Design a binder for this molecule. Structure first.
Ligand code: HEM
Ligand code: HEM
Lengths: 393, 393
């Protein structure tokens, strides 16, 4: 038999029984990635947190030439250290401030957008596709507003993402074509005097402030492309698979419909059980480091399996059940942990909360319109998502 | 180990090594379908032809209540015998005449449509998706013209197909919703005095002719829905995967570009090697019948594996190679054989020939824009297709 291959399944509606067997038997174990590289797959809550909280397991060094790879780069190697670059340019606080859901008018914009999308689906009649015609457009609209860019520019930027977020053994020529185009777009945005709000409006101002005169135009454009992509793919994908989890729990659907004040707790549990990340989070060891029964050697690749942590019964008893009264509800790793904890966590929560609130109000009878096994799961991608999500109501 | 399950792979770019091993060892053998039923999978050219040419292996009887099933019905059971119903209504010759590619102006329409689609892709710039933005729209436009219906009605009818042609273990609620809507649409077309050309224009006339006064309005509408769906899914899917086969053979691409008069021979070979049909063709035995070393019993399900026949080296030496000078070039089973031989075979050939001619003229440098393994193959569907086909040129 060959060395255990990752990822195990592209299906995002259920966790393989094998994850629990692996966590019990070998919570750090050797695997082969799609590139043919070896890696250590970490699958218990304790060991996942250990790796994520130890910066000697480096994100930046995953981009080093000659390293064992999970998958091919789809961005320039310097862009793997995007947040480090942002910090070094003195831009971290400004970026963080631009991406909070608390910005005036933003939540009402989200609600208005969700409700319009849903009204259009109701007008057209069932079946509706909740990914392509709800969750993804909601994510796209949100991120255009957050960035300060025209809504009509969203679709073309969105269309890069089915390739930009591939998880490929080999470099992807289309990724570079789209990256270079999208960078040119963001560079134009920075020069556009009409763009005065949101993240790009703020970066535009900082660009002309003496305190940032030696920050490169490349970095400013890169922030725009990377935040649009990461935010849109992450929120669209999470909301889509959260909707599946909800639709398959009619009792929970009914409870949240009846008591919408429980939606934040529900969304936190949907985050905990979410299978949106298709691969473990990669890190490269910069030292020899003991992780459980394994001495990881300098230069080795480590993969932090989020669902390994999040379904660990030692930390989350009855891990497969959505319980709205857990004593440790935000202690999941859906947003990572440590140095690279998700900058967009509050925005991600709000997108999902508002999307779900709107859907339950407009479509309280929502149900799948096809048997669950008929969903088509995207392969060799950094997220798990159904290509279409057909529903009726 | 469990009984061998079908289908073997949803990948449409390569035949599994296992097909040849099976044909050699056990050219009729027992398998389990997605419903849990047992079936006989037939995989040699000799045995596939035998089954297809013996009407005691019945298409109609596959719809019988209580039969072992390949997959769930997505149409009313009477619609499985659509061609029998057409014949009995005296409509077979008229339907055949309406779907030939030789109709005045049709081939020029195909060429004009292909060229417009391609010009739009060139204007937008690489990468382009040759399935969603070329092959499928070309198929849809063709079938609206063939039916005599407005081009602007094509997209909505097309959108039914990702569900109508599912290969599901269980009935699909959305299939019935879309079927009933599409039937209402075709019924309206038959009543619409503006619709005077194509298949629906002819059926409209025959409907009011005394020789067809006791043919049901249900049958007339059913012909419209079934011919649109079967034709669009079959041509769109075939052309898409033929384009992959061509793109992966730069020499052949160059030869057909240089000598376009060889395109018909090329398309015949692309048909022969095509993996578009995801499942064997189902038949139910109506008698005990010897097939190779197996006595198939009355009531048993038989699956005719088209690629089993078409890659059989006993009939097609060097079966995986496209050879434009074979002595038996149309003797493949891409269009079936016998009673249920494809009514649209000439139209299917023309769609593909014209699409390929246009693509090679406009995009002689066409190549995949992503590694081939990055294509996402649709699962649990009656065809094998990539969800997107990214190319550059
Ligand atoms: C529910 C939605 C989201 C989920 C589940 C999610 C998940 C994650 C995870 C797991 C990480 C850690 C990656 C690692 O440590 O290797 C991360 C980091 C990150 N997230 Fe999110 N994310 C979401 C939404 C967003 C949004 C809306 C944005 C911005 C608009 C965003 C921007 C980022 C960025 C820029 C990082 C990199 C942090 C770093 O490398 O230091 N995310 N996210
Ligand atoms: C390259 C394109 C096509 C391919 C590969 C294809 C393939 C096939 C195959 C394999 C069968 C036999 C099914 C069986 O025996 O169980 C068939 C039958 C059929 N085809 Fe096609 N087809 C194509 C295009 C079309 C088009 C354009 C139309 C109509 C516009 C069409 C209409 C039909 C119909 C109505 C049948 C049923 C015949 C019967 O049950 O007696 N097909 N096709």
């Amino acid at each position: 038999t060959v060395l255990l291959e990752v990822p195990f399944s592209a299906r995002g509606d259920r966790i393989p029984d094998a994850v629990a067997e692996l966590r019990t038997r070998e919570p750090i174990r050797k695997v082969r990635t799609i590139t043919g590289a070896e890696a250590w797959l970490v699958s218990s809550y304790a060991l996942c947190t250990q790796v994520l909280e130890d910066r000697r397991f480096s994100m930046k060094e995953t981009a080093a030439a000659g390293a064992p790879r999970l998958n091919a780069l789809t961005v320039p190697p310097e862009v793997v250290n995007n947040m480090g670059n942002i910090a070094d340019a003195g831009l971290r606080k400004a970026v963080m401030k631009a991406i909070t859901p608390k910005a005036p008018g933003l939540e009402q914009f989200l609600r208005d957008t969700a409700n319009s999308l849903l009204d259009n689906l109701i007008t057209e009649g069932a079946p509706a596709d909740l990914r392509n015609d709800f969750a993804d457009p909601l994510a796209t609209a949100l991120h255009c507003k957050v960035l300060g860019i025209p809504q009509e520019d969203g679709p073309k930027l969105f269309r890069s993402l089915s390739i930009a977020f591939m998880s490929s053994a080999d470099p992807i020529p289309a990724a570079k074509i789209n990256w270079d185009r999208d960078i040119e777009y963001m560079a134009g945005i920075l020069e556009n005097p009409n763009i005065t709000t949101g993240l790009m409006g703020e970066l535009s101002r900082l660009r002309k402030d003496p305190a940032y005169s030696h920050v490169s135009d490349e970095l400013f454009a890169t922030i725009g492309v990377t935040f649009f992509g990461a935010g849109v793919i992450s929120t669209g994908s999470f909301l889509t698979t959260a909707l599946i989890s909800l639709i398959q729990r009619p009792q929970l659907r009914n409870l949240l419909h009846e008591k919408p004040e429980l939606i934040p707790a529900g969304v936190e549990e949907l985050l905990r059980i979410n299978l949106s990340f298709a691969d473990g989070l990669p890190r490269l060891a910069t030292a020899d480091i003991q992780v459980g029964d394994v001495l990881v050697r300098k230069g080795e690749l480590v993969l932090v399996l989020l669902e390994g942590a999040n379904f660990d019964p030692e930390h989350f008893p009855n891990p497969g059940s959505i319980e709205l009264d857990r004593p440790n509800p935000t202690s999941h790793l859906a947003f990572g942990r440590g140095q690279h904890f998700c900058l967009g966590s509050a925005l991600g929560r709000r997108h999902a909360q508002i999307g779900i609130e709107a859907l339950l109000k407009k479509m309280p009878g929502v149900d799948l319109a096809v048997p669950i096994d008929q969903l088509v799961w995207r392969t060799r991608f950094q997220r798990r998502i159904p290509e279409r999500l057909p529903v009726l109501w």
